[PDB]
Amino acid sequence: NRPNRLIVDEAINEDNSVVSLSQPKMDELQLFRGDTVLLKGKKRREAVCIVLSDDTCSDEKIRMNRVVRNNLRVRLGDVISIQPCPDVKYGKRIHVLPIDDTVEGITGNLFEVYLKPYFLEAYRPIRKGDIFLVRGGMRAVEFKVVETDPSPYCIVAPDTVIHCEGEPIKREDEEESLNEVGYDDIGGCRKQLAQIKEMVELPLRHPALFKAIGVKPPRGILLYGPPGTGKTLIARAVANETGAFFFLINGPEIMSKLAGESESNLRKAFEEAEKNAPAIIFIDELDAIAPKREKTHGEVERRIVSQLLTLMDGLKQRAHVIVMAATNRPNSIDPALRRFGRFDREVDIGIPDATGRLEILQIHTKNMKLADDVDLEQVANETHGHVGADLAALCSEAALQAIRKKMDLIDLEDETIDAEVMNSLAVTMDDFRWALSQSNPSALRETVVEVPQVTWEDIGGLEDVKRELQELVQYPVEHPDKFLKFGMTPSKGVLFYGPPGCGKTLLAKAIANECQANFISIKGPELLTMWFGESEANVREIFDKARQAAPCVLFFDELDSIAKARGGGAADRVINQILTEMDGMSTKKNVFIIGATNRPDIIDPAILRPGRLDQLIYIPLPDEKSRVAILKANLRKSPVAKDVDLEFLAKMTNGFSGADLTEICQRACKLAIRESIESEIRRERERQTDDPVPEIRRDHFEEAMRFARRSVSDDDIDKYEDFADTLQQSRGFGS
Amino acid sequence: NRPNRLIVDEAINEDNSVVSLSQPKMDELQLFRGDTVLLKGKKRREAVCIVLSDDTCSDEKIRMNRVVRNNLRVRLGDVISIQPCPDVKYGKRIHVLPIDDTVEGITGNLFEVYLKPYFLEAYRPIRKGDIFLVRGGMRAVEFKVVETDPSPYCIVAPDTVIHCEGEPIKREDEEESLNEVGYDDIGGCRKQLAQIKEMVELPLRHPALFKAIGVKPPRGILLYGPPGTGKTLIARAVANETGAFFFLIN
Numbered sequence: 001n002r003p004n005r006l007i008v009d010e011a012i013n014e015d016n017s018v019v020s021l022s023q024p025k026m027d028e029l030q031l032f033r034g035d036t037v038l039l040k041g042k043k044r045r046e047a048v049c050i051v052l053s054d055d056t057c058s059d060e061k062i063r064m065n066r067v068v069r070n071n072l073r074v075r076l077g078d079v080i081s082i083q084p085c086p087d088v089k090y091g092k093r094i095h096v097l098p099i100d101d102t103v104e105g106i107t108g109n110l111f112e113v114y115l116k117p118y119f120l121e122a123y124r125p126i127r128k129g130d131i132f133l134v135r136g137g138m139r140a141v142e143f144k145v146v147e148t149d150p151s152p153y154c155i156v157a158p159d160t161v162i163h164c165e166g167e168p169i170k171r172e173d174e175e176e177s178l179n180e181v182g183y184d185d186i187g188g189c190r191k192q193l194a195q196i197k198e199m200v201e202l203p204l205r206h207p208a209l210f211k212a213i214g215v216k217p218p219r220g221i222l223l224y225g226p227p228g229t230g231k232t233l234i235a236r237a238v239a240n241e242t243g244a245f246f247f248l249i250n251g252p253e254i255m256s257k258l259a260g261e262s263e264s265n266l267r268k269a270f271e272e273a274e275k276n277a278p279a280i281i282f283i284d285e286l287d288a289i290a291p292k293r294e295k296t297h298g299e300v301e302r303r304i305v306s307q308l309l310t311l312m313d314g315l316k317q318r319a320h321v322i323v324m325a326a327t328n329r330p331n332s333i334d335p336a337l338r339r340f341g342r343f344d345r346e347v348d349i350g351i352p353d354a355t356g357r358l359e360i361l362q363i364h365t366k367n368m369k370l371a372d373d374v375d376l377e378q379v380a381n382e383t384h385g386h387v388g389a390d391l392a393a394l395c396s397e398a399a400l401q402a403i404r405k406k407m408d409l410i411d412l413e414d415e416t417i418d419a420e421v422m423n424s425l426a427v428t429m430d431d432f433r434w435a436l437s438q439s440n441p442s443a444l445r446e447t448v449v450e451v452p453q454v455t456w457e458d459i460g461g462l463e464d465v466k467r468e469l470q471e472l473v474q475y476p477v478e479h480p481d482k483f484l485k486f487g488m489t490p491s492k493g494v495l496f497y498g499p500p501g502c503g504k505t506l507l508a509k510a511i512a513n514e515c516q517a518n519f520i521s522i523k524g525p526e527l528l529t530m531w532f533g534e535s536e537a538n539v540r541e542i543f544d545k546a547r548q549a550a551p552c553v554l555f556f557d558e559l560d561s562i563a564k565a566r567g568g569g570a571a572d573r574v575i576n577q578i579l580t581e582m583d584g585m586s587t588k589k590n591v592f593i594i595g596a597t598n599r600p601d602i603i604d605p606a607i608l609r610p611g612r613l614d615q616l617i618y619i620p621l622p623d624e625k626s627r628v629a630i631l632k633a634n635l636r637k638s639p640v641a642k643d644v645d646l647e648f649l650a651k652m653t654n655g656f657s658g659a660d661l662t663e664i665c666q667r668a669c670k671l672a673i674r675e676s677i678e679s680e681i682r683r684e685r686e687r688q689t690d691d692p693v694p695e696i697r698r699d700h701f702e703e704a705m706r707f708a709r710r711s712v713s714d715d716d717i718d719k720y721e722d723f724a725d726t727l728q729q730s731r732g733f734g735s
Numbered sequence: 736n737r738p739n740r741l742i743v744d745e746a747i748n749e750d751n752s753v754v755s756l757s758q759p760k761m762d763e764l765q766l767f768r769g770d771t772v773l774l775k776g777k778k779r780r781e782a783v784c785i786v787l788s789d790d791t792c793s794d795e796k797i798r799m800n801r802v803v804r805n806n807l808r809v810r811l812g813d814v815i816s817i818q819p820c821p822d823v824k825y826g827k828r829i830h831v832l833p834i835d836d837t838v839e840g841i842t843g844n845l846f847e848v849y850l851k852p853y854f855l856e857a858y859r860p861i862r863k864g865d866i867f868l869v870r871g872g873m874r875a876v877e878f879k880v881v882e883t884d885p886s887p888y889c890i891v892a893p894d895t896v897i898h899c900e901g902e903p904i905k906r907e908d909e910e911e912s913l914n915e916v917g918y919d920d921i922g923g924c925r926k927q928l929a930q931i932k933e934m935v936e937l938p939l940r941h942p943a944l945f946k947a948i949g950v951k952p953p954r955g956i957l958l959y960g961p962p963g964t965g966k967t968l969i970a971r972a973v974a975n976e977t978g979a980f981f982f983l984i985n
């Protein structure tokens with residue numbers, strides 16, 4: 001039917017009165033950016049909005065904020081009709097009232113703090129019956145438009161009168177709160193959130209459709225990841241955005257009950273959910289109820305486990321119910337639960353990446369007034385090893401710091417703290433740097449999986465090797481069809497070998513960056529850390545996380561460290577298992593394995609077998625051209641004098657490794673800083689009785705050159721040159 | 736708010752009759768090292784003290800001992816008004832009485848042992864109703880100034896007479912014991928104790944803020960370390976210094 005009908009989608013402009021279409025659709029229904037559009041949703045409600053163009057928006061979809069989304073009584077995936085509305089006229093009076101539960105903690109002049117800057121210069125199209133949201137004074141309050149003089153909808157011009165008559169109204173039964181959790185409250189893990197969204201939309205959102213079809217949906221989705229990553233958060237969001245009934249099972253609470261009551265509460269939970277289908281039963285801290293079969297020693301505890309198992313099987317009802325569960329330790333869960341027909345789907349909600357943490361930070365600073373000096377992206381880059389909860393907490397603590405120092409002044413009369421005072425409250429970048437020092441990040445020891453920021457431009461020379469890496473890794477990803485036509489499947493892995501400090505580690509990260517694929521680094525020593533017993537299970541989890549992160553490059557660095565320890569029964573079991581995991585790794589899975597070693601003489605020939613690390617790429621010391629590129633790359637970030645001759649520098653340093661060059665750069669720079677520090681003191685002495693000299697000069701290099709030493713001896717090189725010729729012969733007898 | 740208003744902080748000078756300000760603030764209130772200042776706290780109470788300069792003290796704050804802090808019915812972080820007092824006069828007679836629980840173990844001449852050397856060459860500014868503490872004989876007794884002939888406040892000069900009726904008084908309802916635990920009984924780990932003071936001060940001292948702000952405080956503070964490092968000690972001190980209700984789960 002008609003073109004005006006459109007599908008609801010996530011928002012990009014967090015602004016309430018803004019909806020977005022594609023320019024091809026904005027042309028189709030003949031609307032432009034300024035236009036005010038009228039939206040008709042379900043439950044016979046209307047909302048009016050400013051339309052805009054959005055390059056990301058698919059033409060059959062309409063991006064609307066969750067505020068708009070609620071006013072229509074609509075959710076993601078539903079259909080709404082959009083139509084131009086030039087008939088909108090400026091208001092005389094608008095009468096908005098707050099909702100009690102969103103203000104009962106806060107006092108002051110609601111009209112002057114929130115409505116004022118919200119409508120000022122905003123020209124917001126509003127509608128009678130709409131509920132809009134204003135964030136400020138570290139609080140978010142929602143007002144409902146009770147009346148407009150040009151009803152039902154009017155624009156809010158500066159001329160318009162806006163009144164609030166004191167006492168707030170209660171929430172209507174149908175009016176979902178915006179204080180509630182949503183997808184816009186979760187960041188940095190889109191990919192996982194997508195999979196969860198996929199599995200659950202079809203059965204929950206369209207229940208009759210799935211009962212009629214007779215094909216099986218997922219019923220048990222298991223969320224796992226480190227603590228505080230937002231597992232409990234996600235479950236609530238999915239339930240609210242789909243509008244499904246949400247029944248919470250808090251692990252500890254169930255297991256805190258008597259024997260009989262525990263099994264009972266489980267039964268009641270499932271029964272009530274089947275009753276109010278569609279629903280999500282969420283089991284938080286599952287390992288509390290159902291740990292490994294051995295550790296469950298204590299018989300009543302085993303009864304509860306089986307009880308749960310019967311209830312999960314009890315989804316024979318298939319009343320449109322999904323059971324979600326969260327756990328810190330996937331390994332702790334009774335494997336009986338991860339059986340088919342129960343918790344069959346697993347989502348790794350990992351630690352957030354750099355961009356992710358930034359996103360998180362933005363969500364928990366929404367309501368706070370931040371000073372201009374605050375650069376959350378900087379905070380984001382510094383907060384490595386931080387998890388969602390760490391960030392949410394540090395944001396809270398940075399706020400409480402800003403509160404305390406600003407309450408030193410208010411303390412002269414602590415009785416009257418107002419919202420007006422709260423909006424005046426600014427949060428300095430210092431308040432954040434403060435919270436950083438006070439932060440106790442949990443996930444520093446967690447294995448990180450993200451796309452590296454080392455690019456080709458950080459690596460000097462080896463240009464043709466970069467291209468061979470593009471052949472081996474990038475082409476089979478971006479051009480699978482092409483490999484199919486030639487009838488060849490690509491090699492699984494590569495082995496870097498060469499003298500120390502030539503860029504083997506950089507290359508592994510480099511090719512990853514080019515392919516925009518995830519990266520996993522595993523150093524030799526890291527593998528010898530695992531207890532004798534633990535090692536077997538930990539290796540398997542590594543290859544599993546590589547699958548999760550496909551397309552992914554798995555890099556085993558510093559293999560020399562392991563090779564030493566074997567010729568040692570511990571290190572041996574590890575590698576044999578790594579070998580086994582490679583073979584189990586299907587080539588089709590888009591998981592690429594790279595090895596690196598400074599010791600090609602002792603590497604296990606079994607690794608070099610066809611199908612494993614069969615691509616033997618030798619990485620030698622840099623020649624004269626490369627040495628220039630290396631020195632340039634490292635010193636990009638450094639303020640260098642035009643005096644410095646690097647090509648002359650290159651010839652002098654023949655025999656030096658890539659690392660040996662960064663050695664000279666750092667050594668020369670430390671003199672430059674040494675000079676900068678001793679000069680500030682001299683300037684200090686001169687004032688006691690403005691033109692600093694921050695730039696590195698020729699003698700600094702000439703001094704560093706004077707003390708520079710070589711990491712790779714000549715005898716070592718001559719052997720390395722030989723191994724470049726005979727490495728592939730090691731599968732026979734020892735060369 | 737007038738400059739006389741100031742915020743209460745930790746003490747550095749262990750002396751009862753001593754308070755400290757920043758000298759830039761001591762200049763503002765036009766006071767010198769010797770001066771005798773009058774302090775007004777909550778419960779419409781007064782205490783009088785000798786002022787000093789302290790470079791570490793922040794200009795908006797006043798360092799006062801827990802003896803002073805108690806006589807004002809005030810706790811750390813609160814506000815008090817300080818004002819010069821030139822009208823301070825030498826005492827004629829002073830009538831101090833011990834508090835029962837602080838003396839019931841020891842007998843003898845309480846006045847010659849405690850009150851005498853405490854006031855000797857002391858020129859202490861004292862006040863009617865104030866409770867001060869004197870330590871000696873491996874015990875600490877609290878005395879309450881019941882009467883001074885120059886009321887309500889007077890200095891204790893060598894000329895001044897000191898009286899005791901022997902009969903001790905019972906503790907009044909609001910009068911906290913100085914036998915109670917405090918930060919002044921804890922040492923060697925201020926840095927940790929600083930963190931603990933911060934986490935807890937805002938949520939505990941200003942509860943009203945947290946209903947309005949809607950931001951989360953800490954809820955669970957876990958102290959750890961080898962046995963006897965003062966974990967239990969810190970917790971009680973925090974409870975007393977903040978005046979919060981304390982429920983123990985051993």
Ligand SMILES: Nc1ncnc2c1ncn2[C@@H]1O[C@H](COP(=O)(O)OP(=O)(O)OP(O)(O)=S)[C@@H](O)[C@H]1O
Nearest residue numbers: 185186187227228229230231232233360388389392
């Ligand atoms: N990805 C995220 N985006 C936004 N906020 C997050 C994110 N992850 C965690 N948080 C915050 O962390 C806090 C705790 O979230 P939870 O869901 O309870 O953590 P969790 O994953 O359930 O960890 P548990 O309790 O050990 S199972 C919430 O207040 C969130 O705001």
Ligand SMILES: Nc1ncnc2c1ncn2[C@@H]1O[C@H](COP(=O)(O)OP(=O)(O)OP(O)(O)=S)[C@@H](O)[C@H]1O
Nearest residue numbers: 458459460500501502503504505506630658659662
């Ligand atoms: N081609 C290069 N371009 C720029 N810097 C390099 C290059 N090669 C080595 N380096 C420097 O040497 C450091 C480490 O190089 P790696 O990538 O680890 O090479 P490697 O073969 O793994 O040798 P090691 O034993 O791990 S240092 C880097 O941090 C660089 O600063």
Ligand SMILES: Nc1ncnc2c1ncn2[C@@H]1O[C@H](COP(=O)(O)OP(=O)(O)OP(O)(O)=S)[C@@H](O)[C@H]1O
Nearest residue numbers: 920921922923924961962963964965966967968969
């Ligand atoms: N830092 C300190 N300052 C003053 N007194 C201390 C300090 N540390 C320990 N003490 C004394 O040592 C005693 C023990 O104090 P506690 O706080 O109970 O130790 P603890 O941390 O509870 O150790 P436990 O009983 O093994 S948990 C008290 O009598 C204190 O007076």
Ligand SMILES: [Mg+2]
Nearest residue numbers: 231232233284
């Ligand atoms: Mg939780």
Ligand SMILES: [Mg+2]
Nearest residue numbers: 504505506557
């Ligand atoms: Mg390396």
Ligand SMILES: [Mg+2]
Nearest residue numbers: 963966967968
């Ligand atoms: Mg103890």
